[PDB]
Amino acid sequence: RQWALEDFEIGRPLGKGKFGNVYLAREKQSKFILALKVLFKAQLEKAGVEHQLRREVEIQSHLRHPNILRLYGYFHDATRVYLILEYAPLGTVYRELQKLSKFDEQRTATYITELANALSYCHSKRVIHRDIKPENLLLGSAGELKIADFGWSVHGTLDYLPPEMIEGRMHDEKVDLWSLGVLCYEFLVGKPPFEANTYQETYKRISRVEFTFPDFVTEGARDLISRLLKHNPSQRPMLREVLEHPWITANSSKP
Numbered sequence: 001r002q003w004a005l006e007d008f009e010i011g012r013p014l015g016k017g018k019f020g021n022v023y024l025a026r027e028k029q030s031k032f033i034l035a036l037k038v039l040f041k042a043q044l045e046k047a048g049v050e051h052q053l054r055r056e057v058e059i060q061s062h063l064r065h066p067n068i069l070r071l072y073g074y075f076h077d078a079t080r081v082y083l084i085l086e087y088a089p090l091g092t093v094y095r096e097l098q099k100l101s102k103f104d105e106q107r108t109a110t111y112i113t114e115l116a117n118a119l120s121y122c123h124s125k126r127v128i129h130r131d132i133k134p135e136n137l138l139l140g141s142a143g144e145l146k147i148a149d150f151g152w153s154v155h156g157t158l159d160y161l162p163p164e165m166i167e168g169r170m171h172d173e174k175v176d177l178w179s180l181g182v183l184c185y186e187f188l189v190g191k192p193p194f195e196a197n198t199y200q201e202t203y204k205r206i207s208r209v210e211f212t213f214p215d216f217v218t219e220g221a222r223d224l225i226s227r228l229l230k231h232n233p234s235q236r237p238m239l240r241e242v243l244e245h246p247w248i249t250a251n252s253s254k255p
């Protein structure tokens, strides 16, 4: 298993990333269909993030969960690093938001449950994501949600970052609960709650936790979102309490 690019047939582009492209691919020997993410050494090195990727690969390979995207392996050549990923045939939740605009409560609750289960397992293995956002949420063949990208895990737009990360503070696993809250809002409304036209204004609004709801967001959803988007990490609920929220249980199709 000392992989090389010549072991795969490369197919169509699945996405364009900051640091690299993702392509569909097929391993020649087995015909195993997978995704291949190609990052550039020169660009990671120059941005000082090459280590972060040593860490991701190290971390994501101790994780095994149906709502976390698998990293099967990795290799590299003169100038590029390749991640061999599980292929998620239904694409990103980002693209799904574009197509649909916003999701009903049942899709939203179902997705939060999947996320919360995934993050609970991560927290139990002492892992914090730090980078939950719809681009990094992939959909398996049955439409099951899959967390992608552990490039920023430990232990650009600001839209999904909590106050303690933008205000330059110590953070912990409650980072991921803020993220749930941002996503729960975005799913129901179709834009994240602190969205603005400038970095400076978005920063301001995250820092103050300044957001409002459209009249159509139901009271149960407002309750859950408000509990998650607390400025103080320690006032945010545990993952187990998110899963027990009556709005989540009333509306989720998964357990």
Ligand SMILES: O=C(Nc1ccccc1)Nc1ccc(CCNc2ncnc3oc(-c4ccc(OCCN5CCC(O)CC5)cc4)cc23)cc1
Residues within 6 Å of the ligand: 014, 015, 017, 019, 022, 035, 037, 039, 044, 049, 050, 052, 053, 056, 083, 085, 086, 087, 088, 089, 090, 091, 092, 095, 096, 099, 136, 138, 148, 149, 150, 151, 152
């Ligand atoms: O970059 C990372 N780390 C890192 C980077 C730099 C420095 C340090 C760390 N990590 C990282 C970041 C992101 C990823 C996810 C990459 N994208 C994908 N990965 C695996 N499978 C995938 O499948 C897709 C995909 C699959 C299908 C698809 O379209 C299918 C057909 N569509 C379905 C949707 C409908 O609206 C229209 C028709 C579109 C995309 C994307 C994808 C993986 C790893």
